[PDB]
């Protein structure tokens, strides 16, 4: 068979983490030695080939900043085993207990990691389509990886949302929206504004203001990610290097604040 396939005995579903339209998410043990994240498919709510798509994708993929696929059960009921991320989504991590202590240096580090994962995605000429906090997983030691790689109007670039023009450059746009989530502790972009207002206004050239206590150089970085011309936007290789050198090359004067 495929090198991925594993016996059904080698999987233990210990703790339920979520339940969606097409299956469940569990933490468990693989081979009674390896803690893992296990995703399930509900027969009769999804096509086997349809769900077993994002899996065939993560087969070619392999980066330290991308959630790693471990194994599969291609026969129904389906099971998809990946590396376990202990902190859940970046969104929950940012909103909950841990949030209150996260500072600018840590949030910029997490951004640098994600940009590193998207930089690999960039080199492989791939597109994500849903880059946001809800889809970034956190692990031990403030580690962050990209996931779910196979309407978010407030996250989607105008060209993609309107004309379905989805590229790595519309991924960069979503990255700028991801930058606000990190700097506002996981608050929904364009607060007070519905989906309809966002489409009109972004099209009018409106962009989210500098978040409270956020350096203008970082908000400046966001505005580069939000250039209406897809090709005007920066690359994830730039973004990555700009964030990794941030507190030396960009903001050497940094001093801790109340929230950031």
Residues forming a β-bridge with 28: 13, 36
The CA radius of gyration of the chain, in Å to the nearest whole number, is: 19
Residues 26 and 37 sit within 8 Å (Cβ to Cβ): yes
> Is 139 flagged in the annotation as binding?
no
> Is 20 flagged in the annotation as binding?
yes
> Is 19 flagged in the annotation as binding?
yes
CA dist., res. 109 & res. 131, Å (int): 17
Helices (H), 164-208: 168-183, 195-203
Residues 171 and 119 sit within 8 Å (Cβ to Cβ): no
In this structure, which long-range contacts are made by residues 193-196, counting pairs with CB atoms below 8 Å and at least 24 apart in sequence? 195/151, 195/153, 195/154
> Is 23 flagged in the annotation as binding?
yes
> Is 140 flagged in the annotation as binding?
no
In whole angstroms, what separates CA 73 from the centre of its chain? 25
SS3 at position 42: coil
SS3 at position 249: helix
> Is 22 flagged in the annotation as binding?
yes
Residue 60: other Cβ atoms inside 10 A: 8
Please give the positions annotated as active site: 130
> Is 17 flagged in the annotation as binding?
yes
CA dist., res. 257 & res. 237, Å (int): 29
Beta pairing class for 69-73 and 79-83: antiparallel
For the chain, the residues before each gap (C–N > 2.5 Å) are 150
> Is 24 flagged in the annotation as binding?
yes
The annotated binding site for ATP is made up of: 17-25, 39
């Amino acid at each position: 068979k495929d090198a991925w396939e594993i016996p059904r005995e080698s999987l233990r579903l210990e703790v339920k983490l979520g339940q969606g339209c097409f299956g469940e998410v569990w933490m468990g043990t693989w081979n009674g030695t390896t803690r893992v994240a296990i995703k399930t498919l509900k027969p009769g709510t999804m096509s086997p080939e349809a769900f077993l798509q994002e899996a065939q994708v993560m087969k070619k993929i392999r980066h330290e900043k991308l959630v790693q696929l471990y194994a599969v059960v291609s026969e129904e009921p389906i099971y998809i085993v990946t590396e376990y991320m202990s902190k859940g989504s970046l969104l929950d991590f940012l909103k909950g207990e841990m949030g209150k202590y996260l500072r600018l240096p840590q949030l910029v580090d997490m951004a640098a990691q994600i940009a590193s994962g998207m930089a690999y995605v960039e080199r492989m000429n791939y597109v994500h389509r849903d880059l946001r906090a809800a889809n970034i997983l956190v692990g031990e030691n403030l580690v962050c990886k990209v996931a779910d790689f196979g309407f978010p109007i407030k996250w989607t670039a105008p060209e993609a949302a309107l004309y379905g023009r989805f590229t790595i450059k519309s991924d960069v746009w979503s990255f700028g929206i991801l930058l606000t989530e990190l700097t506002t502790k996981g608050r929904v972009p364009y607060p007070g504004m519905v989906n309809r207002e966002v489409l009109d206004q972004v099209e009018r050239g409106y962009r989210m203001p500098c978040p409270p206590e956020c350096p203008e150089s970082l908000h400046d970085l966001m505005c580069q990610c939000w250039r209406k011309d897809p090709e005007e936007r920066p690359t994830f290789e730039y973004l990555q290097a700009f964030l990794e050198d941030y507190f030396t090359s960009t903001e050497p004067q940094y001093q801790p604040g109340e929230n950031l």
